[PDB]
């Protein structure tokens, strides 16, 4: 829209807040629904957040295009691997619990 | 005698190949006014009349003498000299600015960004301009307190890392607070258009709430809070 | 007789081709606690993301699965104090970024902008980060 | 050795305070291609430091009438004001203040939503018979700050070409007509001639001839001096206003709004001494009378502080919410510069050089005038407005809140008169190819000066000389010594010493130019004071205590022998300086008593003046 920048700022805040609610959810109702919500929310929030770092620190049309393109690849591979881990392995919530039992 | 040392940034554009340096001066505090500007004027009048800086009002209203004193951006004319004689006061130009000479920065981008927000009253029907005073209630005028008092010294904006890295496209806290001053003026009819001008990734949204702006303001204003109010208006306004 | 856009353009054109130096900034500016905490929020956020991406890469690339690596780790019979350090180090940036994230979400509502409250809320973020981290590293 | 850059405009305004801003965009708004040349960025001008407000008979607090404001100003000026200019100013005042509010000036407000107005020194209802007037419109106690920021913001809507941080050196004169100005671009050290059909001088005052003043460091009489170097007269420069309440120490202004809101002046013995000096007006008498009163209390042993050298402004009996809403600016300033909490303790204050009543003489239309063989003659192409002009709306004493009004009224007047007199695009007049050459010779001379007396030391000798010889009360012997000391300091400028040999941002040089300018204003001021053998407004001669008019207006005029023009003092001083020698010549021209319309607003004959 013509309000693209304000909608993005609002969406960033909504995803932060969702991710904040997933932390109590993971501890209280761990399971596949949480595991994939964390997969989606963790990838989206970090993709948006890393994009702000790129916007602040990277200058020039080509370096900007390269950083943002590398970031999409990083984010797309990140989300796939997290979904991979949730489907073929123990999933995020169980992994954390297993790590903490060490 | 109470000798105090100042270490002041020096650069001469009329010396070819001159490199920026610090120069130390010694000032007897018993023969000097209490403010840092008093020491700068005393040095210029008595020790080194090549030392160059901006100044006018000497009372913190004009905004001319903004500079970095002891790590913080302030006005030299209201900044008390530190009477601990074991410490040297370092004095720099406003940070991340092109230096014209010594402590004189180039503020013309900062001024051009203020021009770009149209910092003046705008009415949809301006044909009545001059006939009668516009009516503004005491309460709606109170909304301007903390906003209209800005002297445009650039202390806040030159303290903001977001303005350091992206000062070409980010308006910075001085200009953004003045944008909000006109957005909430009840007599102004262009609130939506003023919000619409900040619908891009840089003009407003490089603010990440660092809050150096509000710490540094020699008028005790809160440009950080004014920016947060813009953001809330940005996400709520309809067309 | 010059628009603002023309004025900004002439500024950059004049200055970038000049011999004028750029005045110092980060190397000379005085730090405060809010300023230090603002950049640590960015640093812990980037660190958490790079940790998530590495984890995600290992799930795709390592030939064994997670329970094997947990078993391998336990087989080393590490000291409880060293386990406690590793847990504290893992949870500390998450705890910091989370509590400070909440502080950011409060600012985004327009609350807590008085400079004395920025300082109160930051010190509050620090003690909760410590308390929650030590409580969780004990788990 | 100096690359000269030549420009062509319809009009050039020198100065970007309140008057120059209003003239400059007013000219552009009439279709004139206009340059505004200013030594400071515009919002840094001394106008930004103004506090108490701006007078206009809007009638928002009571029923008002601009003719009462007219009368107050005429009586205020002690009958050295030109009543035609005062008519224009006071009748134009409502429309001018309304113009400012419509630009967006954030005036304090009343319960009806209208502009809040306070009481202020020497203003009354019913032609001096109706009690205290409340017509000083204000933005808290920061009116000048908002006035200037609003005028600057409004000026961004127009095609005015700004030349910021350029220092005007001289006018370009030819055959008695101004052809433009010559200036130094401080940012890059180059010389600029601005050719134009009309030139407007709005450069402010010269409070910095004194050792203690409320004025900015940049109030150096620069346009005044250029006029003197052009061989033109200045007017009434002996008439310097001491504001009753500069803060002790730094000299910072504490607004008369404090007394207008209820504050009172007290001496060492807790007396509200103004009740004795001016039983009706009290602490809201005229500034010349309040300042003389305070000065008497100190020299008669009732000074406050450890040195017995100031008095107190008391505000703490006033409700703290009133201080926060009406006087927030001076509440901060009293803390920073005095460590005073205004809710608990009084502000140490003394009379301090504040405002120059005289200036470049003009008519009511802003046109600069000379005076030749008993006749006023407009100087073609040359206008002045604001504190640098002598219209003269202030005469021997300016009422508080009338200067900011003068700025916007006469800044616009200059624009309106050019528009009714000239058209845009008329062929800008040529100058000789070497015009302005002597201004550059002087600049190069100072830039390389290598004598015995550095600039800061010569300036200090001028300021302490003016301070102790041309103060609130004066006498002939002391003025004569000030004249002799000042002329010597002027000659000793041949021994000047500077150190900065650069040309980019050489404030060592720019302050040596300002010194030359202050010196020309100060020579005219003190030599005019010595010659004026009477007491009128701010000029008090303890060897000539009476006001000397063409009649004795204390008794009926029936049967009085009118005094010849050379035997009385109700006349403007016209001062000229031979810039090489420093010799001051003085002439006189009549005060204008006719208004613009006798049926609409009677000329006010002179009278005993008492508050
Ligand atoms: C000193 C003062 C005066 C004052 C006041 C408070 C203080 C501290 N409060 C006032 C008030 O509440 N009500 C009121 O009516 N008057 C008040 N005053 C007096 C009044 O402010 C001044 O007389 C008035 O503001 C002067 O205005 P003006 O527009 O004439 O001039 P300025 O603001 O001093 O600006 C001078 C401009 O001229 C430019 N300039 C000067 N020299 C040069 C050269 N050589 N070349 C180019 N430009 C020059 C300056 O840059 C400035 O822009
Ligand atoms: C970073 C590493 C993650 C830090 C998380 C710390 C929390 C660890 C924890 O104590 O969880 C325990 C919980 C229950 O397990 P247990 O302690 O055995 O208690 C049994 C009785 N309730 O186990 C659970 O139910 C898990 C609930 C929490 C899930 C948290 C999910 C978000 C993790 C995002 C971390 C991103 C950073 C990655 C960095 C490391 C990469 C190398
Ligand atoms: C797991 C998490 C990861 C991997 C992560 C990562 C990030 C990253 C990389 C950023 C960008 C940093 C910046 O722009 O300075 C960021 C920003 C942010 N995060 Fe997180 N984060 C996590 C959890 C949380 C939680 C639980 C909250 C609550 C939260 C709130 C925020 C906020 C409010 C911002 C924006 C700060 C600003 O606007 O300047 N985050 N996060
Ligand atoms: C994960 C943890 C990340 C944060 C921890 C990193 C360490 C932080 C180091 C920086 C702290 O630096 C310190 O901050 C404090 C509080 O703002 C500053 O103190 C500030 O507030 C005090 C009290 O109102 C004022 O007197 C003082 O003028 C001001 O500088 C101090 O000058 C600065 O030197
Ligand atoms: C990863 C961060 C590396 C980097 C380019 C940091 C720049 C910078 C900031 O933007 C910043 C933000 C808030 C407070 C202090 C800051 O100081 C910095 O070094
Ligand atoms: O000069 C004036 O008109 C008024 C002041 O200086 C004042 O604010 O007291
Ligand atoms: S908000 Fe404060 S620091 Fe920033 S420009 Fe205005 S007065 Fe100066
Ligand atoms: S310091 Fe800069 S990031 Fe925002 S809160 Fe202030 S403008
Ligand atoms: S000289 Fe005006 S703000 Fe310092
Ligand atoms: K509005
Ligand atoms: K004047």
User: Looking at residue C130, which CATH number applies to its domain?
Assistant: 1.20.1300.10
Method for this entry: X-ray
Question: Residue D282's closest CA among D272, D271, D297?
Answer: D272
Distance CA B110, CA B88 (A): 30
CB D455 within 8 A of CB D517: no
Distance CA D496, CA D10 (A): 38
Distances in whole angstroms, Cα of residue A72 to Cα of each of A8, B206, D127, D434: 17, 21, 79, 67
CB D462 within 8 A of CB D511: no
Task: Identify the three-state secondary structure at position D241.
Answer: strand
Question: Residue C44's closest CA among C95, C80, C102, C88?
Answer: C95
CB D174 within 8 A of CB D45: no
Distances in whole angstroms, Cα of residue D310 to Cα of each of D62, D295, D352: 36, 9, 11
Could you tell me whether strands D4-14 and D190-201 are parallel, antiparallel, or unpaired per DSSP bridges? parallel
Protein residue whose Cα sits closest to atom 29 of ligand 4: C32
Could you tell me whether strands D240-247 and D234-235 are parallel, antiparallel, or unpaired per DSSP bridges? unpaired
Question: Residue B4's closest CA among B37, B24, B35, B26?
Answer: B26
Quickly tell me which residue has 């100087």 as its tokens. D379
Quickly tell me which residue has 């008095």 as its tokens. D311
CB D366 within 8 A of CB D383: yes
Per-position DSSP letters for D278-326, written without gaps between them = -TTTGGGS-HHHHHHHHHHHIIIII-BTTTT-BEEEE-TTS-HHHHHHH
Give the count of alpha carbons within 13 A of A75, CB side only. 19
Distance CA D405, CA D387 (A): 11
Distances in whole angstroms, Cα of residue D402 to Cα of each of A52, B87, B220, D120, D123: 53, 48, 31, 10, 11
CB D104 within 8 A of CB B121: yes
Residue from D46, D136, D256, D352 whose mutation best tests the ligand 6 pocket (most atoms within 8 A of CB): D256
Quickly tell me which residue has 């960004």 as its tokens. B113
For residues C132 and C115, state if they share a domain.
yes
Distances in whole angstroms, Cα of residue D118 to Cα of each of B133, D100, D331: 17, 17, 18
Question: Residue D123's closest CA among D79, D60, D51, D64?
Answer: D64
Q: How many residues does chain B have?
A: 239
Domain span including residue C57: 32-139
Handedness of CA A10, A11, A13, A14 (dihedral sign): positive
Q: Which long-range contacts (CB under 8 A, 24 or more apart) does D594-603 make?
A: D594/D83, D594/D84, D595/D70, D595/D83, D595/D84, D595/D86, D595/D87, D596/D84, D596/D87, D596/D88, D596/D91, D596/D364, D597/D87, D601/D67, D601/D70, D601/D87, D601/D91, D603/D83
Q: How many CB atoms lie within 10 A of CB D600?
A: 10
Structure token pair of residue D538: 């701010």
Distance CA D168, CA D174 (A): 18
For residues C86 and C96, state if they share a domain.
yes
Q: Which long-range contacts (CB under 8 A, 24 or more apart) does D183-187 make?
A: D183/D37, D184/D443, D184/D510, D185/D5, D186/D39, D186/D504, D186/D505, D186/D506, D186/D510, D187/B100, D187/D504, D187/D505
For residues C78 and C125, state if they share a domain.
yes
Distance CA D77, CA D241 (A): 11
- Cβ contact, residue pair C46, A53, below 8 Å: yes
Distance CA D165, CA D38 (A): 6
Distance CA D604, CA D61 (A): 26
Distance CA A83, CA A92 (A): 9
Report the b/e string of D150-179 with b at 16+ CB within 10 A. Answer: bbbbbbbeeebbbbbbbbbbbbbbeebebb
Beta bridge partners of D360: D389
Structure token pair of residue D466: 């003016």
Counting CB pairs under 8 A, whether chains D and C reach 3 or more, is yes
For residues C20 and C66, state if they share a domain.
no
Question: Residue D89's closest CA among D56, D132, D116?
Answer: D56
Burial status of residue A73 (CB atoms within 10 A of its CB: 0-12, 13-18, 19 or more): exposed
Whether residue D159 lies within 8 A of chain C, CB to CB, comes out as: yes
Question: Looking at the domain D241-355, which fold is it?
Answer: Flavocytochrome C3; Chain A, domain 1 (3.90.700)
Distance CA D228, CA D171 (A): 10
For residues C49 and C62, state if they share a domain.
yes
CB D214 within 8 A of CB D251: yes
Quickly tell me which residue has 């021994």 as its tokens. D495
CB D265 within 8 A of CB D311: yes
Catalytic residue among D22, D287, D398, D609: D287
DSSP element (H, E) containing D343: none
The class that CATH gives domain B107-239 is mainly alpha
Distance CA D444, CA A37 (A): 76
- Cβ contact, residue pair B231, A9, below 8 Å: yes
Task: Name the phi and psi angles at C23, rounded to 5.
Answer: -65, 150
Give the count of alpha carbons within 13 A of D424, CB side only. 10
Task: Identify the three-state secondary structure at position B36.
Answer: helix
Structure token pair of residue B70: 């002891």
Quickly tell me which residue has 């840089």 as its tokens. B202
Q: Does domain A1-102 have CATH number 1.20.1300.10?
A: yes
What percent helix, strand, coil does chain D show, rounded to 5? 35, 25, 40
- Cβ contact, residue pair B165, A5, below 8 Å: no
Chain D residues touching B100 at Cβ < 8 A = 187, 504-505
CB D360 within 8 A of CB D206: no
| Nearest-atom index, ligand 8, CA of B173 | 7
Chain C residues touching B119 at Cβ < 8 A = none
For residues C20 and C54, state if they share a domain.
no
Structure token pair of residue B148: 């209209």
- Residues 6 or more apart in contact with residue D270 via CB below 8 angstroms: none
Partners for B (CB, 8 Å, 3+ pairs)? A, C, D
Q: How many CB atoms lie within 10 A of CB D3?
A: 9
Rounded CA Rg of chain C = 23
> Domain ranges in chain B?
1-106, 107-239
């Amino acid at each position: 829209s013509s309000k693209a920048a304000s909608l993005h700022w609002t969406s960033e805040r909504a995803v932060s807040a969702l991710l904040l609610g997933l932390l109590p959810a993971a501890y209280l109702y761990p399971g596949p629904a949480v595991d994939y919500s964390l997969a989606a929310a963790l990838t989206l929030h970090g993709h948006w957040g890393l994009g702000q770092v790129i916007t602040d620190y990277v200058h020039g049309d080509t370096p900007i295009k390269v950083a943002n393109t590398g970031l999409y690849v990083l984010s797309a591979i990140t989300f796939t691997g997290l979904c991979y881990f949730n489907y073929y392995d123990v999933g995020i919530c169980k992994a954390v619990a297993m790590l903490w039992s060490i | 005698s109470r000798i105090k040392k100042f270490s002041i940034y020096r650069w001469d554009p009329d010396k070819p190949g001159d490199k920026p340096r610090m120069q130390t001066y010694e000032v007897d505090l018993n023969k000097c006014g209490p403010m840092v500007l008093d020491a700068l004027i005393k040095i210029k009048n008595e020790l080194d009349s090549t030392l160059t800086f901006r100044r006018s009002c000497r009372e913190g209203i004009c905004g001319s003498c903004a500079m970095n004193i002891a790590g913080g951006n302030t006005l030299a004319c209201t900044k008390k000299i530190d009477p601990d004689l074991s410490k040297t006061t370092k004095i720099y130009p406003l940070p991340h600015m092109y230096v014209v000479k010594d402590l004189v920065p180039d503020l013309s981008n900062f001024y051009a960004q203020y021009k770009s927000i149209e910092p003046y009253l705008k009415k949809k029907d301006e044909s009545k301009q001059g006939k009668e005073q516009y009516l503004q209630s005491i309460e709606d005028r109170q909304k301007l307190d903390g906003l209209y008092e800005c002297i445009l010294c650039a202390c806040c904006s030159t303290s903001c890392p977001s303005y350091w890295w992206n000062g070409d496209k980010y308006l910075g806290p001085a200009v953004l607070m003045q944008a909000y001053r006109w957005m909430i003026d009840s007599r102004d009819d262009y609130t939506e258009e003023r919000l619409a001008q900040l619908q891009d990734p840089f003009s407003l949204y490089r603010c990440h709430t660092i809050m150096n702006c509000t710490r540094t303001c020699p008028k005790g204003l809160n440009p950080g809070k004014a920016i947060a109010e813009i953001k809330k208006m940005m996400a709520t306004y309809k067309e | 007789a010059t628009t603002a856009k023309e004025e900004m353009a002439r500024f950059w054109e004049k200055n970038t081709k000049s011999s004028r130096p750029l005045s110092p900034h980060i190397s000379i500016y005085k730090w405060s606690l809010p300023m230090a905490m603002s950049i640590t929020h960015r640093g812990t956020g980037v660190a958490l993301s790079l940790g998530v991406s590495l984890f995600s890469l290992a799930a795709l690339l390592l030939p064994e699965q997670f329970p094997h690596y947990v078993a391998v780790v336990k087989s080393l019979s590490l000291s409880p104090a060293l386990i406690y350090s590793a847990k504290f180090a893992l949870v500390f940036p998450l705890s910091y970024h989370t509590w400070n994230g909440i502080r950011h979400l409060v600012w985004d509502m327009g609350k807590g902008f008085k400079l004395s409250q920025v300082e109160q809320s930051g010190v509050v973020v620090l003690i909760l980060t410590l308390l929650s981290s030590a409580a969780i590293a004990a788990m | 050795q100096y690359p000269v850059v030549d420009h062509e405009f319809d009009a050039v305004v020198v100065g970007a305070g309140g008057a120059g801003l209003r003239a400059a965009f007013g000219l552009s708004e009439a279709g004139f291609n206009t340059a505004c040349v200013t030594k400071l960025f515009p919002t840094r001008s001394h106008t930004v430091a103004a506090q108490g407000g701006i007078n206009a008979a809007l009638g928002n607090m009571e029923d008002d009438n601009w003719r009462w404001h007219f009368y107050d100003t005429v009586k205020g000026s002690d009958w050295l004001g030109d009543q035609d200019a005062i008519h224009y100013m006071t009748e134009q005042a409502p429309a001018a203040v309304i113009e400012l509010e419509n630009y967006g000036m954030p005036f304090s407000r009343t319960e009806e939503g209208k502009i809040y107005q306070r009481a202020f020194g020497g203003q009354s209802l019913q032609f001096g018979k109706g009690g205290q007037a409340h017509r000083c419109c204000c933005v808290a106690d920061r009116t000048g700050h908002s006035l200037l920021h609003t005028l600057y913001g409004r000026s961004l809507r127009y095609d005015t070409s700004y030349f910021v941080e350029y220092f005007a050196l001289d006018l370009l004169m030819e055959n008695g007509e101004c052809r433009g100005v010559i200036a130094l671009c401080i940012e890059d050290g180059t010389i600029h001639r601005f050719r134009a059909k009309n030139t407007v001088i709005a450069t402010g005052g010269y409070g910095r001839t004194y050792f203690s003043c409320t004025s900015a460091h940049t109030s150096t009489g620069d346009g005044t001096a250029m006029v003197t170097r052009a061989g033109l007269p200045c007017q009434d420069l002996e008439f310097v206003q001491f504001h009753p309440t500069g803060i002790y120490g730094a000299g910072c202004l504490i607004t008369e709004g404090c007394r207008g809101e209820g504050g009172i002046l007290i001496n060492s013995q807790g007396e509200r001494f103004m009740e004795r000096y001016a039983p009706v007006a009290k602490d809201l008498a005229s500034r010349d009378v309040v300042s003389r009163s305070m000065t008497i209390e100190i020299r008669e042993g009732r000074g406050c502080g450890p040195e017995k050298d100031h008095v107190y402004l008391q505000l703490h009996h006033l409700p703290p919410q009133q201080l926060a809403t009406r006087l927030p600016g001076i509440s901060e300033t009293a803390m920073i510069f005095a460590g005073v909490d205004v809710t608990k303790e009084p502000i140490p204050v003394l009379p301090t050089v504040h405002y120059n009543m005289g200036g470049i003489p003009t008519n009511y239309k802003g046109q600069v005038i000379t005076h030749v063989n008993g006749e006023d003659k407009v100087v073609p192409g040359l206008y002045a407005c604001g504190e640098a002009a002598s219209a003269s709306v202030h005469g021997a004493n300016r009422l508080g809140a009338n200067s900011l009004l003068d700025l916007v009224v006469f800044g616009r007047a200059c624009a309106l008169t050019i528009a009714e007199t000239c058209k845009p695009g008329e062929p800008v007049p040529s100058i000789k190819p070497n015009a302005g050459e002597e201004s550059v010779a002087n600049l190069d001379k100072l830039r390389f000066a290598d004598g015995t007396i550095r600039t800061s030391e010569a300036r200090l000798n001028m300021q302490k000389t003016m301070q102790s010889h041309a103060a609130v009360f004066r006498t002939g012997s002391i003025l004569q010594e000030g004249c002799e000391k000042l002329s010597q300091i002027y000659r000793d400028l041949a021994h000047l010493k500077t150190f900065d040999r650069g040309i980019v941002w050489n404030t060592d040089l720019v302050e040596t130019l300002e010194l030359q300018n202050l010196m020309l204003c100060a020579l005219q001021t003190i030599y005019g004071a010595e010659a004026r053998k009477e007491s009128r407004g701010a000029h008090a001669r303890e060897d000539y205590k009476l006001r000397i008019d063409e009649f004795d207006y204390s008794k009926p005029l029936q049967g009085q022998q009118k005094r010849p023009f050379e035997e009385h003092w109700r006349k403007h001083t016209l001062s000229y300086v031979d810039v090489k020698s420093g010799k001051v010549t003085l002439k006189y021209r009549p005060v204008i008593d006719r208004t613009l319309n006798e049926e609409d607003c009677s000329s006010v004959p002179p009278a005993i003046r008492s508050y």
